[PDB]
Symmetry: C3
Subunit: 362 residues, 3 copies
Amino acid sequence: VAAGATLALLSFLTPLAFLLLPPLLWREELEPCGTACEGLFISVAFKLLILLLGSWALFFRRPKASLPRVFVLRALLMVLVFLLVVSYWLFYGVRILDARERSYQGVVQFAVSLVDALLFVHYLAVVLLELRQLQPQFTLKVVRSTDGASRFYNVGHLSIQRVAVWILEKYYHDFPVYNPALVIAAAARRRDNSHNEYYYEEAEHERRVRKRRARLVVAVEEAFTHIKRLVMDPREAAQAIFASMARAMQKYLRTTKQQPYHTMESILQHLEFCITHDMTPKAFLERYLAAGPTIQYHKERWLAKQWTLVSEEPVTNGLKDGIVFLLKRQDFSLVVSTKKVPFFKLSEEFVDPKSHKFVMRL
Amino acid sequence: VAAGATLALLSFLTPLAFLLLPPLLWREELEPCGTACEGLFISVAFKLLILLLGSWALFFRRPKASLPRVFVLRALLMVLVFLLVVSYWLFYGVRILDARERSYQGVVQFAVSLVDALLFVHYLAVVLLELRQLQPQFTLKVVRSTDGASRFYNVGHLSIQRVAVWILEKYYHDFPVYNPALVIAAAARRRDNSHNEYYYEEAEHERRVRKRRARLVVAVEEAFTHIKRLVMDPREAAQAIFASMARAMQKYLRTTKQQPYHTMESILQHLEFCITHDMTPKAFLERYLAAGPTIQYHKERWLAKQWTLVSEEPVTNGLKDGIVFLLKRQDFSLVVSTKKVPFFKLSEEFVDPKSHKFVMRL
Amino acid sequence: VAAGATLALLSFLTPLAFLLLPPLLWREELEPCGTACEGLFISVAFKLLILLLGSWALFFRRPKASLPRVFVLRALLMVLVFLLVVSYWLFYGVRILDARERSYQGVVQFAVSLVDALLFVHYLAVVLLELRQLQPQFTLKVVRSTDGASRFYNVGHLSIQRVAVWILEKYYHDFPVYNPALVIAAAARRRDNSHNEYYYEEAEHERRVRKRRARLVVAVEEAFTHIKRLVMDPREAAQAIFASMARAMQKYLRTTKQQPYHTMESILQHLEFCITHDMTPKAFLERYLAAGPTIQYHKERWLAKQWTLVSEEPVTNGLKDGIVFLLKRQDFSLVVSTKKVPFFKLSEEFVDPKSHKFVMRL
């Protein structure tokens, strides 16, 4: 960041320094030039403005993740910007500044080429960091090692660590939140021929969950009917309608193992939120009936600063068919399996929309 | 649009005017130049062609939405194009046109710098309007205020109104279609200790929906068996097989509260569509068994021109953690809650794929 | 590819040839020039480096699909690169090479304009091939003609064949894998008034599937408890724990019609995979309990080289509202229906967050 910000500042200041050093250090010795110089000054002004606006739009933002190894392409871009600026300064010093270049059109064109090169480096930074991974090259199966919640994704050419950050950005809203509260063949044959206890326990659990869900739906409908939109603030109204639903809410959160996700304070805040935004009882209960993804919950359950990238291959090398890597937290892990999206061979077949003719039997 | 199209036309015509005014108004007074002029003419030709092709590809398309406030970045881009063109014209007039610039190489280089600056403005327009929001910065919980249908999305740096249009583009194919047809603690305790009427009503409704679904599946299988692919048109065949399924279809649409979504005319059109495209009875019933999203239905149920953006913050300012805003229609509303995607700190751990060694017990 | 690679190589070599032919064929006749030449050499060096890096990042990759007709925009780009290079060579030959141009600054500026034009052609290639379809213009309903598995997508301005490849890239991880093993009004009335055989058969099938699923969950829990992480390799451990679950796995794959998807060898490989990556019994069974998408399976079931694009309209023309086309394989087909994303008219409404005041009754 500090090095990157310094490189950006020096890159933006370099054309202006190139254009100001001759008119300041040697103005009389400098050879006067016509209108091409001023036209190039205007072009430099607008191209520096374009460069600053684009840099703000894409690159004046905080790093979104702390990668385990160096950001390979962004390091290459910093090196390229640095080599460009340093080489331009070297040449400028040794052949313009030292020689006290009388031809000012040459210096102005050198600064113009610098600004063009910086806009092209910005374009290259966009191509490397944003566009190389638009075309989906690979499909990733991401599975939690505990409950098997699986999603498949398409991803372009990213390094394994950038792919890891990408999958983490997807995880906090795609998978449900992690709820930890949720001879040999002869032994298998003896088990299979026993009472199917798990089947009936699962059926009973689903039945009691449906019963508690019904109780909760009725309780929340009654609770929201206990107030009118129209004196009383939305917080006071949430607190007044929470009493007629606190027991059913608590019992449903207990039967579905959702106690630590939803405190009384968070449920009151969400009641206030809903009744403020005209949300019906069902738009209130959508948060509590289903498991819901990780970002939906409190920030102390995210623990985004505690991801470990376990990769058999070095993480700076991009994906290829078969790369498996783990994203481990303290409790679960995300197993990511890579499969290259297969080569497609489309053929074109033409059918006449009038050629569809049908008959009675079968 | 009109102002934007005028700016685009003037920007494309400005280099050509710069290159044609000297050879027309003062050709004898103009100083002849060598081959660099013609090389720059060829470069201007190909760069104007590139500019026109890119403008067609991205910016010669109709506005996709009517935002409540000004499009901030596109207004900035129009202002930038206008300032660039107007300043180039001012300088050209006062130092080339008025002075009758004899050096034609300078004028050609000025036009070249203009074309470069327009290509760079096009690049900046792409960066501002398309690329600033590629990197997912925020996660949006979008919930219908009526039935609680919720989806989470990742979105980059967009203003709240552009985020609203984005969420609307997502809504018509993500959420199911809106079907409107679908002391105090002592009172809550008395209710919870009563007959769980909602549970048994829900079970009975699901049972009768499954029964009507089974009747409909059988009816549609029989109906499609009542015709063969092979005289009779697909429309006549749809009308001939609709009789053997009209009652079951109507009864299933009534039990699932889907009467106004599917008219006899639309069902006949979809029968014709399916039997034209070799779609099986199940590929036919996929439209009718599930609720389905909004765009699947008739255009009079979209009402895309009737969205209201209710935001506590001004809608030209981009998203930040905690921005809640409503997208209200006549009936329901989309509550959108923003949460910044958290900062990730990946660590790298290496495991030896050969180091996995297991033992018998537990 | 061969023509494209040749065009790329010639385009990269053309500036260097332009800069080397005068200093080699006529060095004495060549007019010496100052430092502007060397500054432009450095700019050419860094801009050719930028061009090569961007071309590698985006365009040095194998074609991802075999389209039925010509890639219209990529053909336009090849034609544009070719016309640019050929016209630059024509002018260079006839006015620099033949005339033995003494002014070397002109030749260097011509090469600089060439490199700028190639970077701008690269930018135009990005705009045409990657950016024109970022803005979602259309919504596509993709439905399998057999089981009606449907997904809606947003897609920008792509041709119908590029849209087809896009939908295929989505299909192998979005839809479940294709499992083929899964007067007239008076006749309809007689059928509807008969025993609802399909309802009870469906209920019985779901019940026995739940029973086999419970047996399989218990069997896999026991199997994974039959080993400890800690001598025995993960393959030997998978083979040792497969015996206590092989029967339940086979019976569940038979009741859900999943025999050909999962061989004993693939199940052993996946057991080894899971027990290697600390995946619990449920993270193991996530692959077998649900249908799962196509890419999850063996590569002989993908058959990506056997897609047929059946389109009523020519496939080189982009999408518009109402374009329906088929993606046919040997067994099923993907019906794709296009609907233009509707024009949105947002309005802004302001509500005071303090103005929310509620009252007791109803």
